[PDB]
Structure formats: C-alpha cells, structure tokens
Ligand binder design. Structure first.
Ligand SMILES: CC(C)(COP(=O)(O)OP(=O)(O)OC[C@H]1O[C@@H](n2cnc3c(N)ncnc32)[C@H](O)[C@@H]1OP(=O)(O)O)[C@@H](O)C(=O)NCCC(=O)NCCS
Ligand SMILES: CN(C)CCNCc1[nH]c(=S)nc(O)c1Cc1ccc(Cl)cc1
Ligand SMILES: [Mn+2]
Ligand SMILES: [Mn+2]
Length: 217
C-alpha cells in the first residue's frame, strides 16, 4: 500500500504520512531551522522528520536530530544514508545502512501536468521527443521532473557536487523503471566513478513517487 515501500528494497525501511497529524514537534536542535518559517514549511519539515525517525528506529537508531548541510542536504548519522521528500498530500523518508547500500534518493510530486514553461527548462531536446512517444494516460513530463530530482538526491551524498537538470538524461519505461545517464564528470568522493543510476517509479493516490538506490559495490 505504501508508495516508498513499493519502489525500494526491503533492506531500506521507509515511512510516510499523507497529512500532518496534530501535535507533532521538531526536536529542540531542529527548531532554529524553521523558527521563522511559514506554517506549511514548519509542518512538512516536522512531519517528514517524524517519518525519518520512525524508519531510523527500525534500523536500531534512536531519536536524533536531522539537520541540513550547506546545500540543504539532510545530515544522517554516521553509517546511514537516506532521503526525504514532501509535497501536498505526502511526507516520506527512507533510510539504509552504508554496509548494505551506497545511496538512496526519493521524490514525490502531484500527478499533474508540469507548470507552464517548466518542461522546456528541465528537459533535454531528446527527452522531449522520448516523452511524446510514450503511451497516453500518464503525465510523463511530471514523472521526468520527479525522476531528475531523485537523481540529484542520490548523486549529491556520493559526490558533494551540483547536478543540473541538463547534466543527466533520464529514460522512463512504462513498466515502473527508469534510468539516469550522467553527462558530466562522475568522479565520486571516494575515488569511484558514477555513470548511470537505475530507478523505480509508482503512481498512486494522485501522486508520483520516484526512487533510486545506488547498490553496494
Ligand atoms: O521532494 P522535496 O523537493 O520536497 O525534498 C526536499 C528535501 O530534499 C532534501 N534535500 C535538499 N537538498 C538536498 C541535497 N543537496 N541532496 C540530497 N537531498 C537534499 C531535504 O531533506 C529536503 O527536505 P528538508 O528541507 O525538509 O530537509
Ligand atoms: C531547494 N530545494 C527545492 C531543492 C532543489 N535544489 C536542489 C538541487 N537542484 C538541482 S536541479 N540539482 C542539485 O544538485 C541540487 C542540490 C544542490 C544545490 C547546490 C549545490 Cl552547489 C549542489 C547541490
Ligand atoms: Mn517539498
Ligand atoms: Mn519533487
């Protein structure tokens, strides 16, 4: 039933909530990150971290703040990788151990057409042709944008570098999989080279969820 659980391996616990339940709070160390934020932002931040802490508890990790790094990236405990996402109708998190996976990224979007002008900004010309050839009945433009955001989220923890929308070519398969081919230097922080990712996608509850797990070497 859960969207994230449907697109990541069993080894990576996940948790998701479709509403902001009443009474949640950030941990004291997290409060400065949203002290001057509007209610919508405070709620997505608090609810997604409740989900992340639930998934971390399944790995045996007790309650811990999840702060943000210089490029907005969540800062996980030592030996943990993870990803978080929030959109209207969805808050979710997924975590894993570094001995079991290299990286994970997820992104949730509403299953709707992209806003005017966004596809032109994010898609390579060949991607635009590819999407037009896919079967009718799915918002392929929104799925491409979702998959590209998941691509940067899986990439950043391994490279500490920017990955623009024009820096990767995503190919969507109607069967619930996609591939991301990196078009820039793929040197990773540990000296390895990243060239391509394998992704999974699902559409349910009016939402698109994309996920990439970069597997153990
Ligand atoms: O899907 P969304 O765009 O909502 O995800 C936003 C999340 O991406 C994550 N994210 C932001 N910058 C990121 C980066 N450079 N790399 C990886 N994940 C990142 C954050 O956890 C953010 O949620 P937060 O600001 O509440 O922590
Ligand atoms: C602000 N929220 C909505 C998140 C969206 N932005 C994040 C973002 N988007 C794209 S397209 N590519 C990326 O690599 C990054 C992360 C990043 C930022 C800056 C640097 Cl320098 C390095 C990595
Ligand atoms: Mn969000
Ligand atoms: Mn998104």
């Amino acid at each position: 039933d859960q969207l994230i659980a449907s697109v990541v391996p069993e080894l990576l616990p996940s948790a998701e909530l479709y509403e902001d339940p009443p009474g949640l709070e950030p941990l004291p160390e997290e409060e400065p990150l949203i002290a001057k934020s509007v209610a919508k932002r405070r709620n997505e931040f608090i609810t997604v971290r409740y989900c992340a802490r639930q998934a971390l508890s399944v790995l045996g990790i007790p309650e811990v703040p999840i702060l943000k790094g210089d490029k907005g990236q969540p800062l996980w405990p030592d030996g943990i990788v993870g990803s978080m996402t929030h959109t209207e109708g969805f808050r979710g998190a997924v975590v894993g151990r570094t001995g079991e996976v290299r990286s994970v990224g997820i992104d949730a979007e509403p299953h709707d057409v992209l806003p005017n002008g966004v596809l032109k900004s994010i898609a390579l010309p060949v991607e635009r042709d590819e999407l037009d050839a896919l079967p009718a009945g799915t918002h392929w433009d929104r799925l491409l944008f979702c998959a590209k955001e998941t691509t940067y989220k899986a990439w950043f923890p391994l490279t500490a570098r920017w990955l623009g929308f024009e820096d990767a070519h995503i190919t969507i398969d109607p069967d619930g999989t996609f591939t991301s081919r990196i078009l820039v230097d793929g040197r990773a922080n540990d000296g390895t080279v990243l060239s391509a990712f394998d992704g999974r996608w699902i559409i349910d509850k009016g939402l698109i969820l994309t996920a990439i797990v970069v597997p153990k070497l």
